[PDB]
Amino acid sequence: DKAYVAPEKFSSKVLTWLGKMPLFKNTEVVQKHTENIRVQDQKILQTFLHALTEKYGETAVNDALLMSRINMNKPLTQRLAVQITECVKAADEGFINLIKSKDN
Amino acid sequence: DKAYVAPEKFSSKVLTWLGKMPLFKNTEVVQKHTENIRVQDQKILQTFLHALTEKYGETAVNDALLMSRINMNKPLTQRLAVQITECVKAADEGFINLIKSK
Amino acid sequence: LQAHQDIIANIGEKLGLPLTFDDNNQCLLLLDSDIFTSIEAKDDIWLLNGMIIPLSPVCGDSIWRQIMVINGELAANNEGTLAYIDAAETLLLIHAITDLTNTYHIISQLESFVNQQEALKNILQEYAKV
Amino acid sequence: LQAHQDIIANIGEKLGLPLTFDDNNQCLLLLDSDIFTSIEAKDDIWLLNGMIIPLSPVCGDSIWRQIMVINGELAANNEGTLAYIDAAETLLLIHAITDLTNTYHIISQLESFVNQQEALKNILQEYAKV
Amino acid sequence: LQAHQDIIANIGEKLGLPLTFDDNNQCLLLLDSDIFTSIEAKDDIWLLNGMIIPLSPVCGDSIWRQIMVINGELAANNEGTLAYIDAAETLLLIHAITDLTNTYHIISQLESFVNQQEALKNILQEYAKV
Amino acid sequence: LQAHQDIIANIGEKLGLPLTFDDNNQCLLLLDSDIFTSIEAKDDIWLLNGMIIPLSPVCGDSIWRQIMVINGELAANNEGTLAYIDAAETLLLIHAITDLTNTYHIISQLESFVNQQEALKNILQEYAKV
């Protein structure tokens, strides 16, 4: 189907469905289709499509895996936890400054 | 009434009891006695006596009443209490700086 | 995906256009004349992708820092994230929609997203890559 | 507010400590002796903040870019946003919890946030101010 | 030190908190979120420290003399000593507890110290640094 | 007052003098030729009073601060308090003895006090007003 333009505005702006995009894998096939779409700035649309394509694939998928390796899914229930909300008041009142200075 | 010097030293120093002092209220009586006793630094010695007398003078008594007026003898068992343990670390680590800035 | 397609179709009727997801799980949109947006189906959530500006990977400290400071304001209001897509040398606004049980809610999320897109483009256009 | 207090109190129970929000709707935490995390009640949502590293405002293109690229990865799975607090010259992770209807589900989201924060600190530690 | 730990633990039970002396032989407390009071086990005694106000090292004769005149009052009833900590530019109340044989008597002494500290802060608040 | 008189009579036996408190509840003493001290009976305790130096009420920040810093060291060791007596323009050292059950303890406290007095006079004599 072709790109369709909605009759009523959206957020005070004309709204247009650019139609289905061919599988991102076929870079040239995508470029072909894109050129046949009337837009104020062809290059911008092209770049946006490249960006959507790059979001996944190899480099991204790999950094995701490495992240998965480094990320030690430790249980929160077993971590040591201390509520330190009052430390801000301690600093503002000059309590922390007193404790630290007495160390020297 | 008179000063007695101890025969043996105390803390390696000659110890002397200056004797009983007249009632502090009678300022001139005290002054007169301070002169009649065998003491070298006669001037350092009433000054000290003046100081001891003033510790319980009018001003002092009144400031104590005011303090007791300002002092809210609140029950310690009812105050909110928290034990501080990681506050210096949080400051050194820059966490407090972060929260205060956000 | 059938569920996603039904939801996106319902939104299309409300907006007046045959919206649907393509083979890339994307639905490309154009607002006014220069605002490119995409609705993406991803497992249990939908991601809204928004073209901001093509940007130099070496734009300099001042520009990167400004964008990162802006990320603070956006995240505080859960409006989305400004991210850099490396090879494409593109700055994108990305925001996930976790609640897909309501058509009204989704549309509300979308309209706030495009307005945010517009505001950011106006702030960062001067840095756009010639 | 009372509902927020009741929610974090329930969380505290599962974690073994009496948690509460202060006058500024915040709860600060130190986990494992080196992870600093904050929870902030804001309207219908909770904002999570996790300090990553103190960072020079002029750290250079390479570091800013690596961080902004990571933002894309985080946004894909709605894990949060890396932002810069200029006045503090600090990099932090920010994430909103929008579903506050189930205690253990909130615990699950808090857990993933803290683990993401820990993972990011490990990755970017070398860039921390000297 | 173990004996000191047992004593302060007894006090904690009375006050409803698990109190203990840290690595520096100190127990740091925040009372009513505005009063900083510390307890230090030192040989046979416990040293209490209570911050009054941050004070300029050149606050002038009037303020210095007033504080020193108050020392005469405190010393008369053995309530403590007002001292200046140079490196911290802070006015501090200090008092030693020499009788640690009775838990509730210790509590009584701690209560009097805190009340004295609170009273001095009210009287000298105007002289605090910016 | 009799109990107090019996205790000081005992101390007197140990020192070699027929000591007793006067109508002012004071016992004036002179050590060497320039150390003036007094033992004062006050309710349940005894107060040791030591003349340090006659001092100007407008001696200046530098001198007052030095004295207030010394108060921190004195209080840390429970050796006494340096206090200013206004009208008399005098700096005194004051220290309470709260345990009067033992003659040996009282004597030890007195010897530490007079020695502390001498040390302070050596440090502060240069500030004494002629």
Which uninterrupted H or E stretch holds B99?
helix B95-101
Buried b or exposed e, range F47-83, using 16+ CB within 10 angstroms: bbbbbbbbbebebeeebbbbbbbbbbebbbebbbbbb
Q: Are E90 and E84 in contact (CB under 8 A)?
A: yes
Which tokens go with D99? Answer: 């579903």
CA A21, chain centre distance (Å): 21
- Tokens at C109, concatenated: 């999320």
Number of independent structural domains in chain B: 1
Q: How many CB atoms lie within 10 A of CB D83?
A: 28
Burial of E107 (0-12, 13-18, 19+ CB in 10 A): middle
The residue written with tokens 């897109």 in the block is C117
Rounded-to-integer distance, Cα D48 and Cα D38, Å: 6
**Is B87–A82 a contact, with Cβ atoms under 8 angstroms apart?**
no
Find the closest chain E residue to B65 by CA distance. E73
**B1, burial (CB in 10 Å: exposed 0-12, middle 13-18, buried 19+):** exposed
Distance CA C45, CA C3 (A): 12
- SS3 of A72-101: the string is CCCCHHHCCEEECCCHHHHHHCCHHHHHHH
Mutation target vs E (from A86, A88, A102, A104; most E CBs, 10 A cutoff): A102
Is there a contact between F111 and B13 if contact means CB atoms under 8 Å apart? no
Phi and psi dihedrals of C12, rounded to 5?
-60, -40
In angstroms, rounded to a whole number, what is the distance separating the alpha carbons of residues F64 and F55?
10
| Burial (CB count <10 Å: 0-12, 13-18, 19+), residue C61 | middle
E and B interact (at least 3 Cβ pairs within 8 A): yes
Shortest distance between the Cα of B91 and any Cα of chain D, in A, equals: 11
Report whether F116 contacts F124 (CB < 8 A): no
| Strand C81-85 relative to strand C90-97, pairing | antiparallel
Q: What b-and-e string marks burial along F30-44, b requiring 16 or more CB atoms within 10 Å of the CB? A: bbeeebbbbbbbeee
For C31, what's the count of Cα atoms within 13 Å in the CB-facing half-sphere? 24
Verify whether the Cβ–Cβ distance E92 to A98 is below 8 Å.
yes
Chain A CB within 8 Å of residue B102 CB: no
Resolution in A: 1.9
Quick check: B85 contacting A, CB < 8 Å? yes
F43 touches chain B (CB under 8 A): no
Q: How far, in Å, CA of E59 to CA of E56, rounded?
A: 5
Q: Scanning the structure block, which residue is given the tokens 């400031």?
A: B63
Buried/exposed B87-98: b ≥16 CB within 10 Å, e otherwise = bbbbbebbbbbb
Q: How many CB atoms lie within 10 A of CB B73?
A: 12
Q: Of A103, C61, E31, C93, which is closest to residue B77 (Cα–Cα)?
A: E31
**Residue F16: its chain B contacts at CB < 8 A?**
6-8, 15
Report the 10 Å Cβ neighbour count for B62. Answer: 10
| E28 touches B83 (CB < 8 A) | yes
For residue C114, which phi and psi values (nearest 5 degrees)? -65, -35
Q: How many residues does chain B have?
A: 102
Instruction: State whether residue E39 sits within 8 Å of chain B by CB.
Output: no
Amino acid at E29: L
Calculate how close chain F gets to E16, using CA atoms only, in Å: 29
Instruction: Give the structural domain span for A77.
Output: 1-104
Burial of E125 per CB tally in 10 Å (0-12, 13-18, 19+): exposed
Q: In sequence order, what DSSP letters do the residues of F35-52 get, joined into one string? A: EEEEEEEETTEEEEEEEE
Domains for chain C: give ranges and CATH numbers: 1-130 (3.30.1460.10)
- The amino acid at residue D63 is I
The DSSP line for chain A is: ---EE-SS-BTTB-EEE------TT-HHHHHHHHHTS--S-HHHHHHHHHHHHHTSSSHHHHHHHHHHHH-----GGGS-EEE-TTHHHHHHTTHHHHHHHTT-
Residue indicated by tokens 């699950």: D108
Closest residue in B to A97 (Cα) is B88
Q: Which residues does B5 contact at the CB level (< 8 Å), separation at least 6?
A: B14, B15, B16
DSSP reduced 3-state for D11: helix
CATH of the domain at A91: 4.10.1330.10
Render F80-130 in DSSP notation, one character per residue.
Answer: -EEEEETTTTEEEEEEEE---S-HHHHHHHHHHHHHHHHHHHHHHGGG---
- The residue of chain B with its CA nearest to that of F14 is B10
Method of determination is: X-ray
- CB-based contact B82 E19, cutoff 8 Å: no
**Contact across the interface for D18 and A64, Cβ inside 8 Å:** no
- CA-nearest of B89, F12, C119 to D31 is B89
| Helices within chain C (DSSP H only) | 2-15, 61-76, 103-124
Q: Which runs of consecutive H residues, i.e. helices, occur in chain E?
A: 2-15, 61-76, 103-124
Supply φ then ψ for residue F77, to 5 degrees.
-105, 10
3-state secondary structure of D22: coil
Q: Give me the torsion for CA of B37, F5, F96, B68, rounded to 10°.
A: -100
Decide if F114 contacts B84 (C-beta within 8 A): no
Q: Which two tokens stand for residue A89?
A: 């008041």
How far, in Å, CA of E70 to CA of E53, rounded?
15
Q: Are A83 and B87 in contact (CB under 8 A)?
A: no
3-state class of C50 per DSSP?
strand
Comparing CB atoms, the residue among A86, A98, A102 nearest residue E33 is: A86
Give CA–CA dist D4/D55, Å, rounded: 33
Tell me how crowded residue F45 is: count the other CB atoms within 10 A of its CB. 15
Alpha-carbon span F53 to F70, nearest angstrom: 15
- Residues of B with a Cβ under 8 Å from any F Cβ are 3-4, 6-8, 10-11, 13-24, 39-41, 44-45, 47-48, 50-55, 57, 59
Rounded-to-integer distance, Cα F71 and Cα F60, Å: 17
Q: Which of E1, E19, E21 is nearest to E9 (CA)?
A: E19
Q: Chains with ≥3 Cβ pairs under 8 A against D?
A: A, B, C
- Neighbour-count burial of B63, counting CB atoms closer than 10 A to its CB (0-12 exposed, 13-18 middle, 19+ buried): middle
Of A82, A86, A100, nearest to B88 by CB-CB distance is: A100
